[PDB]
Amino acid sequence: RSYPCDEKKQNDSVIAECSNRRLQEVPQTVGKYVTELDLSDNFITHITNESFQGLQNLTKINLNHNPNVNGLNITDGAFLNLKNLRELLLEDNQLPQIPSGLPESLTELSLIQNNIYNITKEGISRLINLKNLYLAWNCYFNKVCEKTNIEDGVFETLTNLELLSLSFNSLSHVPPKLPSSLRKLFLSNTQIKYISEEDFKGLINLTLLDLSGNCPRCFNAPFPCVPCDGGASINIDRFAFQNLTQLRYLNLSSTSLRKINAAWFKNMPHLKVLDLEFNYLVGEIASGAFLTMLPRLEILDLSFNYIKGSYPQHINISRNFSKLLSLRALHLRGYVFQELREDDFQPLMQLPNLSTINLGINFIKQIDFKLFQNFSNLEIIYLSENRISPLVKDTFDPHSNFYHFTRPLIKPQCAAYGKALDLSLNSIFFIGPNQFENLPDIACLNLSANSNAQVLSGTEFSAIPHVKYLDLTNNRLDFDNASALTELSDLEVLDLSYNSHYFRIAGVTHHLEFIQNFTNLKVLNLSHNNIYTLTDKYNLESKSLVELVFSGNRLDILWNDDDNRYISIFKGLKNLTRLDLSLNRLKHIPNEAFLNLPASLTELHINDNMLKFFNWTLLQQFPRLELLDLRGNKLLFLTDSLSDFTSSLRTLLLSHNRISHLPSGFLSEVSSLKHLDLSSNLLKTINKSATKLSMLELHGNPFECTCDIGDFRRWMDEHLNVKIPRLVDVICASPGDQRGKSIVSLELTT
Amino acid sequence: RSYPCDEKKQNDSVIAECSNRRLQEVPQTVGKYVTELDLSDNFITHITNESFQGLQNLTKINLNHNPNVNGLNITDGAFLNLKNLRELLLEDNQLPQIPSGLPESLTELSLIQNNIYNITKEGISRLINLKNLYLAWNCYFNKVCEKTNIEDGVFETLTNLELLSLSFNSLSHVPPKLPSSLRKLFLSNTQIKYISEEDFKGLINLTLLDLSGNCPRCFNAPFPCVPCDGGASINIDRFAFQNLTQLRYLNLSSTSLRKINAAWFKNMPHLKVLDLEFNYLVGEIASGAFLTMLPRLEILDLSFNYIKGSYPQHINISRNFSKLLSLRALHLRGYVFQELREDDFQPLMQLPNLSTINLGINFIKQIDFKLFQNFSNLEIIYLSENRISPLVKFDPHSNFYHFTRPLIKPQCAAYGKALDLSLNSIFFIGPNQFENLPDIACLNLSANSNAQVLSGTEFSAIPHVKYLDLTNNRLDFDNASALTELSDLEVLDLSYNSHYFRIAGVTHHLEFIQNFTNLKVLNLSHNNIYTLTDKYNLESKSLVELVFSGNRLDILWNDDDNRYISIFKGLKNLTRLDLSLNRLKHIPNEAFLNLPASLTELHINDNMLKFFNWTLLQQFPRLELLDLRGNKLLFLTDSLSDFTSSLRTLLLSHNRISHLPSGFLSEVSSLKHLDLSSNLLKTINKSALETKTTTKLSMLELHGNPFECTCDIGDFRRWMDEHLNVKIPRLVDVICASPGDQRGKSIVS
Ligand SMILES: *[C@@H]1O[C@H](CO)[C@@H](O[C@@H]2O[C@H](CO)[C@@H](O[C@@H]3O[C@H](CO[C@H]4O[C@H](CO)[C@@H](O)[C@H](O[C@H]5O[C@H](CO)[C@@H](O)[C@H](O)[C@@H]5O)[C@@H]4O)[C@@H](O)[C@H](O[C@H]4O[C@H](CO)[C@@H](O)[C@H](O)[C@@H]4O[C@H]4O[C@H](CO)[C@@H](O)[C@H](O)[C@@H]4O)[C@@H]3O)[C@H](O)[C@H]2NC(C)=O)[C@H](O)[C@H]1NC(C)=O
Ligand SMILES: *[C@@H]1O[C@H](CO)[C@@H](O[C@@H]2O[C@H](CO)[C@@H](O[C@@H]3O[C@H](CO[C@H]4O[C@H](CO)[C@@H](O)[C@H](O[C@H]5O[C@H](CO)[C@@H](O)[C@H](O)[C@@H]5O)[C@@H]4O)[C@@H](O)[C@H](O[C@H]4O[C@H](CO)[C@@H](O)[C@H](O)[C@@H]4O[C@H]4O[C@H](CO)[C@@H](O)[C@H](O)[C@@H]4O)[C@@H]3O)[C@H](O)[C@H]2NC(C)=O)[C@H](O)[C@H]1NC(C)=O
Ligand SMILES: *[C@@H]1O[C@H](CO)[C@@H](O[C@@H]2O[C@H](CO)[C@@H](O[C@@H]3O[C@H](CO[C@H]4O[C@H](CO)[C@@H](O)[C@H](O[C@H]5O[C@H](CO)[C@@H](O)[C@H](O)[C@@H]5O)[C@@H]4O)[C@@H](O)[C@H](O[C@H]4O[C@H](CO)[C@@H](O)[C@H](O)[C@@H]4O)[C@@H]3O)[C@H](O)[C@H]2NC(C)=O)[C@H](O)[C@H]1NC(C)=O
Ligand SMILES: *[C@@H]1O[C@H](CO)[C@@H](O[C@@H]2O[C@H](CO)[C@@H](O[C@@H]3O[C@H](CO)[C@@H](O)[C@H](O)[C@@H]3O)[C@H](O)[C@H]2NC(C)=O)[C@H](O)[C@H]1NC(C)=O
Ligand SMILES: *[C@@H]1O[C@H](CO)[C@@H](O[C@@H]2O[C@H](CO)[C@@H](O)[C@H](O)[C@H]2NC(C)=O)[C@H](O)[C@H]1NC(C)=O
Ligand SMILES: *[C@@H]1O[C@H](CO)[C@@H](O[C@@H]2O[C@H](CO)[C@@H](O)[C@H](O)[C@H]2NC(C)=O)[C@H](O)[C@H]1NC(C)=O
Ligand SMILES: C[C@@H]1CN(c2ccc(C#N)c3ncccc23)C[C@H](C(=O)N[C@H]2CNC[C@H]2F)O1
Ligand SMILES: C[C@@H]1CN(c2ccc(C#N)c3ncccc23)C[C@H](C(=O)N[C@H]2CNC[C@H]2F)O1
Ligand SMILES: *[C@@H]1O[C@H](CO)[C@@H](O)[C@H](O)[C@H]1NC(C)=O
Ligand SMILES: *[C@@H]1O[C@H](CO)[C@@H](O)[C@H](O)[C@H]1NC(C)=O
Ligand SMILES: *[C@@H]1O[C@H](CO)[C@@H](O)[C@H](O)[C@H]1NC(C)=O
Ligand SMILES: *[C@@H]1O[C@H](CO)[C@@H](O)[C@H](O)[C@H]1NC(C)=O
Ligand SMILES: *[C@@H]1O[C@H](CO)[C@@H](O)[C@H](O)[C@H]1NC(C)=O
């Protein structure tokens, strides 16, 4: 670690981190060692020939977000210097023009979120070895520019260009004279309404094309959005893509398509993913004209093609959907329909490869759960945000994808265990006794936020006893009855976060006895169940359990139990490694209670409590403990003799406490501490009296910079490997002459 | 000037409000005219004959909740002085016995929430004159007491007792030897499992009986709740109520009743109100035994009687329901069923007096709204907490079982026929959503995640809507047509609306508001409005109130083209304006001068103001209330007497004020009420508020100030004692801060 840039080594290339250090010029310490430089989130506004000299070993400069609040001054040839400069990022800098005078060694140039309106030869016709060029957000509702002007041939010379991102800019036409070497052409939100034959004449190599937000369909647009001539459509000629033989991805989101010409995929048997969401294509879904041309598609998205004023009975799926033999996921979010039958999805049932169906936000009230058994390999069923009821009787970031969320539908940690079903945000206020009948073998089940008030008695998941991951978060479930969920003999993950039932009985209040007949349950989350009361004893004997979260409960109220009934409330869980006691409003954990914790614990969090006094001396029973998180507490003091107490602990987060005095016998035991966190306490000074540590957090402590402090800065220098995060945020409170400056940029003994 | 009690005139005598003054003992500082003394919610730990010597004239004493944060120590006859004592409340005092020297003249005695496990004749029986007696929560799960020991017939020579409350007291027998004069008897949650025949005899006079919470059914109980043996209901002998001819009120809420012995009501021609929520009577609802013994019943609650596991297809309503001819209110919550069709409700359509139909929490999937026309006196239809879809092509003095709040906001109910459709699944407004409804005047569509794009044709089917509640939805109204099919509309509530159609340059269009000639209120709180897109003049001759909090005026008035100066000047009639929570720091001078001069209340509390230009108030002749609480104001003005003569109330608590100017208000002065609490005042140098003529000022609040009480304060504390016509509230919150020997209480010291 040198000041002002924390330094670390990756590969045979030294990287320098000077981001968010608030500096106003190119730093000084940066040795010729450095090869990739990071300068983002600063207050720099000047870049000269002198800024970058001597460093010639540099291949890269980050430099985005400068200054942070005219723009940022770049001098003709301030970079012409370095013959190693590969990548050069300059996003969000308020640049008026394209840096005049630039290195040829440049491969990947970024220039987005600036004020470049002229695109000129004088700027970029020299960077031949340019590969990836980004230029989104440059004439995007600035009104000091009608069109992003591009001068002819500004792309025909950059013969090594693979990627061009002109998305989110104001062009009316498609830039002529591009290089045939192109592979990705991003042009979203560019205001193109006419697409010619010529526009894409001879990019025979192009793989991805992105034409969204052209004539948008402003459902929930996270940015300025303006529709075409009423319900007007982006107008695409049939021979627009004749040449585009090599092509995997097509994103035609928000174009307001009504009719899909099927002449477009005539010469393109390649295409792997089609995005046709936020359009008007209900007719085309039903009359699948193009649906014939796509045998190698694996993912299809037709989401938010719903018609205003409409709520059909059923969803009209063309037969031409059985020509989609390669499909692996289908995305049908927000058609909006009332009932799904076996019939309606008939065309998809003889599709061999289809493994995800996405039906969320379709506000559907009834589905035949049988119809899902006629699939040959499905393990994702997403039905979130529909109106399924209890069943009775019947046996900002531009680097992102705006039109298609890339987060997993289900949690991987769940989609692991087998077939995943998501019934979250539905109307299942209790569990109908027919709720699960005709369901495939379910491994992963989400019932999140159904305000489900079901008394559980162990009957309810009988149709599906083979569940592993079950998520019941945000519900009003009762499980005072000990038979509760016990049908689920294979269950490993129970997520019961935030549950208040409606059947409090006195002396039955909370009854966890039901945990004990699990032979296989590993993760148990009971956060925010507001338990202040057990009628099950303190013995919860289970060797299955590894991790228990017990946040948002009332541990205090239990441990003030006047007859002392609640001491070993966790002893029985012998195999517990991780435990979580945060937000239980704890003041004094009685000594005998703390000593009755699984001797097996690896992590222990008692943070965001009200803790005053910690009896450190009790850490001797916990010899596997690697992490102790005591953050957000009212702790004053630290044991002078940590030696006596532990030799297993690796991480000790203490921040947001009221620690004034850091004692003398720190590092008295082989403390195994690589990571020590003391930031946001009440430290005036660190004495002299106080090599295995790589991290120390001190930021935001009232430092008293008097020379009395200078012992510490000698230690910060003898021991130079131990990194301090945001050094520049460890500051002087005092004295007056000092208040504001960093401990490190401090002229000492004067 | 009274200390410490605020001393009000009421009817013909003097109240003393000494409640909640951190008081530790009764002051002998209260007057002699006082007949009523509230000493509630204080820290008093003792009571003796020296406590209340001086005022034999007292009739009522409060005392409740003393002390706070041990017990209350009453000696034998601390009240035997008080010859004029009618009332005496003593609830929440950790009392170990019944006080032992009370006067006869007691005719109302409340001793709830104490620690009296036994009732002795030494204490009460010699109190012949009592009329009311409340004894709830005394043996209420102590682990000390199994039983609320009642001396056999302790109540026998209480021959005037009208109201006896014994609720929430573990005694499984109805005490014997009761007084005949009893009209009202409460026995809720007493663990009385069996009601004999001899239990109620001699109570010819009884009009109310309370027996709920015995053999409870524990749905949502907000206290300890313990079911009887297995699923066992209460047991009441056939001839229990043989003698109770005069009974009007009968609570059997949560008794677990499967079966209603229609023989209980043989002698009760009179019964008006029947509470039977929280039992298991789906069947007794299907086939009404009792339903015929009740001609004169006006109110019937059978809420939360559903069967668990079950979600039937229809509700089953005995035709035995048109024998309740008197019926005014019917409550049917938590039957839970899928569908109400016309014929299911045929038996109720032949009732003259029925106005309130309560169908809350039935999770109803669909309804034939036609059925509602076929009702004569229908006013409130309550359909909250159902499942309707878009149609296409702690307190012990309370009622625990019944919700006694208005089902519908009265302001709404006033206009007439009310339909509450809140907490349903109407995610947009179906083109057939209101076909075959009555003419509704008041409509609630709150909390339906309703995303409807409005075009002003969505409401054609019921176009006489005057009060429309649209809070907590996701409604677009950028179309100048939006809602215009509702010409008669008077109140529009759109709090908390965030749409999904943000087009740029249309953004937020507020043009639809120029249509209404009788729109009177409009609540636009919390819409995140920061972008508006029309010609300036919002033009509304009608509109009187605009709530505009939780928006971004700050953002709007910071416009560099000044496009939003005159954003509200077109609202000529407006007299109320709430501009709080806009995070405003500076209101531009021209932006303020373009508020309508008509305003009368202006609210800019809870923003971030530092400076306020008083001398603009001049353009505001009718202004009368100004509220700038929770801003950050520093400086006032020395000539405010010049810039406004209309202004009645000025509120400025929670600001950064320490200097009080040597002008202000004297002689040419601006009326009645001045709040200057939670400021930063050290001292006031009399130069503020001169004794020029007589300033009209009645009331002035200055509590929670950081006061400097050495000698400086000599001038004000004179001024106080001479302007007795100037009320300062809360003299026990006007504290010192400066002299470290004075920091606390004081000003009065
Ligand atoms: C009710 O309770 C349950 C249980 O308490 C809650 O769920 C648990 O929740 C935690 C918290 O989110 C989950 O942890 C997260 O899981 C992510 C995926 O993990 C796996 O994949 C990665 C890579 O594929 C592997 O490395 C992991 O394997 C490791 O194995 C063990 C753990 O078994 C570790 O000890 C090893 O060291 C290995 O790492 C997993 O198989 C994971 O991404 C995530 O990690 C980030 O966040 C944590 C902070 O919690 C950091 O410690 C960690 O360094 C990561 O942070 C960095 O980088 C990302 C980008 O990569 C940045 O965005 C971040 O800022 C960050 O710096 C974490 O481990 C856990 O899986 C889960 N358990 C269960 C039961 O599934 C419920 O949520 C709860 N209900 C609610 C909602 O209240
Ligand atoms: C979206 O915007 C709309 C527009 O504001 C909101 O609607 C307003 O909401 C307010 C605020 O809650 C409602 O006013 C409230 O109305 C109460 C009922 O009033 C009627 O009768 C009363 C008694 O029955 C009559 O006195 C009234 O007459 C008043 O009339 C003119 C007004 O027309 C006044 O100028 C007179 O002086 C009269 O007083 C009404 O006809 C009323 O109860 C209530 O006042 C209690 O409240 C206010 C606090 O704002 C005090 O001024 C007042 O002292 C009252 O309270 C003392 O009393 C109680 C128990 O009695 C203690 O428990 C309290 O602490 C308190 O100290 C208040 O007035 C208004 O009706 C309503 N407007 C409409 C169009 O319905 C919506 O809320 C809003 N939506 C939200 C949630 O976002
Ligand atoms: C089972 O069911 C039975 C009967 O159905 C329940 O018995 C009810 O118990 C509650 C206790 O919570 C009773 O409430 C209180 O009554 C007092 C006194 O009564 C009324 O007395 C006067 C004449 O009627 C008058 O002062 C009041 O009357 C009208 O007054 C105004 C008119 O200006 C009108 O607007 C009111 O609505 C009244 O109609 C008065 O109500 C009453 O004073 C109590 O309340 C209020 O005010 C005080 C302020 O000092 C405040 O602290 C309270 O919170 C409250 O706002 C209160 O309403 C109720 O009367 C009983 N019902 C009947 C019909 O007798 C029983 O509780 C149920 N069991 C259980 C355990 O749930
Ligand atoms: C239309 O869909 C096309 C294909 O979905 C979109 O291009 C995809 O775009 C995002 C770019 O933001 C890519 O994510 C970024 O990629 C780099 C390089 O692997 C990586 O560091 C990222 O973090 C992030 O993943 C994504 O790879 C890309 N997909 C492919 C496969 O080319 C585009 O989102 C669409 N248009 C709009 C406007 O949303
Ligand atoms: C089950 O459903 C809930 C609801 O969709 C999921 O929680 C969402 O989770 C994502 C990422 O974990 C969060 O960003 C959202 O805030 C959550 N939304 C809500 C409303 O809770 C959860 O991921 C699902 N769990 C499983 C087992 O996959
Ligand atoms: C319309 O329905 C909503 C939902 O019931 C009502 O608001 C509830 O109102 C009461 C009283 O103001 C509050 O205690 C609740 O917390 C409210 N909840 C919600 C969802 O806001 C509202 O009162 C009804 N409006 C009318 C016209 O009476
Ligand atoms: C896809 C549908 C479109 N919806 C609708 C809006 C307006 C309509 C009109 N006229 C309409 N007409 C018919 C059918 C649906 C309609 C709203 C709905 C929604 O509420 N979405 C939420 C879910 N949680 C996140 C957020 F995206 O999404
Ligand atoms: C009246 C219904 C009964 N409910 C039910 C719960 C569990 C059941 C099981 N097994 C059940 N089985 C059949 C029918 C209803 C059932 C719960 C539901 C509710 O959500 N209550 C909340 C709503 N607002 C506050 C509070 F009143 O109310
Ligand atoms: C990196 O390049 C610089 C510039 O030519 C050179 O002086 C230096 O020796 C190289 N780095 C090292 C120390 O290997
Ligand atoms: C592209 O289109 C032209 C049109 O004349 C065609 O002749 C040429 O061969 C095409 N190139 C391909 C498909 O590689
Ligand atoms: C594809 O199927 C649809 C509906 O089943 C039909 O409209 C269309 O003609 C089919 N396409 C062909 C036959 O090319
Ligand atoms: C708990 O659930 C079991 C299984 O359904 C049920 O039989 C039992 O009655 C319940 N509890 C008891 C002991 O009453
Ligand atoms: C486990 O499961 C059975 C249900 O078959 C139940 O009878 C038994 O009591 C359970 N044990 C518990 C609650 O630990």
Ligand SMILES: *[C@@H]1O[C@H](CO)[C@@H](O)[C@H](O)[C@H]1NC(C)=O
């Ligand atoms: C019953 O009440 C009446 C008035 O309602 C009263 O006059 C009568 O004395 C009471 N009955 C007896 C005899 O106690």
Ligand SMILES: *[C@@H]1O[C@H](CO)[C@@H](O)[C@H](O)[C@H]1NC(C)=O
């Ligand atoms: C009341 O009506 C019910 C249902 O229609 C019926 O079972 C019962 O016999 C009626 N009671 C009589 C006839 O008294």
Ligand SMILES: *[C@@H]1O[C@H](CO)[C@@H](O)[C@H](O)[C@H]1NC(C)=O
């Ligand atoms: C219905 O209400 C009126 C209004 O007070 C009342 O006079 C009448 O007696 C009631 N009719 C019956 C007997 O139900």
Ligand SMILES: *[C@@H]1O[C@H](CO)[C@@H](O)[C@H](O)[C@H]1NC(C)=O
């Ligand atoms: C409404 O029609 C019903 C038939 O369900 C009929 O019995 C009823 O009398 C009609 N309403 C009235 C009160 O006229």
Ligand SMILES: *[C@@H]1O[C@H](CO)[C@@H](O)[C@H](O)[C@H]1NC(C)=O
């Ligand atoms: C607004 O509504 C009218 C009538 O329903 C319609 O003709 C007009 O085109 C609408 N469009 C908008 C959002 O301006």
Ligand SMILES: *[C@@H]1O[C@H](CO)[C@@H](O)[C@H](O)[C@H]1NC(C)=O
């Ligand atoms: C304006 O509102 C006041 C009440 O606020 C009312 O008296 C008057 O009639 C209204 N006048 C007009 C012009 O609508």
